[PDB]
Design a protein around this ligand. Sequence first.
Ligand code: NI
Length: 341
Amino acid sequence: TCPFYKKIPGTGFTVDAFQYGVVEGCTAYFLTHFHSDHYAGLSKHFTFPVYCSEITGNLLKNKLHVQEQYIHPLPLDTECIVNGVKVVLLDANHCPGAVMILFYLPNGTVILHTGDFRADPSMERSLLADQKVHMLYLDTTYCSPEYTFPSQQEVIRFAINTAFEAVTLNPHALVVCGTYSIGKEKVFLAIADVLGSKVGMSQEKYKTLQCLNIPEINSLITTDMCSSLVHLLPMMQINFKGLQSHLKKCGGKYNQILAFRPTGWTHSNKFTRIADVIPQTKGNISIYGIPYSEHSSYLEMKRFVQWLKPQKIIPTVNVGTWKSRSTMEKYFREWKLEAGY
Ligand code: NI
């Protein structure tokens, strides 16, 4: 049954709770972003209102075939009223169309649900600055001090230089980028831009990207694999067997694949730096795993929470074990101690 951490008290609202059936008491279902563990159970047969960003609305309509009459897109950074309750959507710095939700309760309580987010100093100058927040429903994916990773910009710089060098040395080398959901488009689009290419992909992935309000997107992407020296593939196909096969499909037009797997965290981040990474090479194919995160590092998360000063924190990730829960609660007490709220 629907967990408490997906319910907004003193409203008829749930958040990312589509896989429980009809939740008793729910008049409006919010969807923070289009990732499968969060929309799980939405379909063309869903008959209750869905509140979400314009981009997430494009994806529900065009990918899941949800009927238009149930989709309520809201603009960002705008005071909106939903079934009598003031709400605001804020950019979550996660994947395209991902939002955080501010709920202003009739009683005067203010609630922030982060969805999935990568906390950033810039959030300290949004509409969150303008009043007290009592409760925080927090993306705790990497809530442990060992999770350090570099800035997105650093990782993108590394990827652009590596690709450029390899292709300049061998103009018949192909770049491949793995994907499985929306998110991490900056990795492949930055690589393509530096190489003066469009990105080649399947028709299904092409449609997906057409939903994202990316400016000039038609000048950036393509289905024509032949006219394209950055390609996208399923992450499931980013391995030697899967790459070889794909190299065989290109019709003797490339003699070398440089591929990137954008992974969240791996235990090689507790030792090695970004400058000091290496690939896994079997022949003319080489696969790099790069630590491109769309969730908060430990330190990013800690700074955000210390700034916001919430009275209560409810974790939304890593909640299924007692050890995880207990460990998160300890970090939250230390943060409040070190800062004095
Ligand atoms: Ni997500």
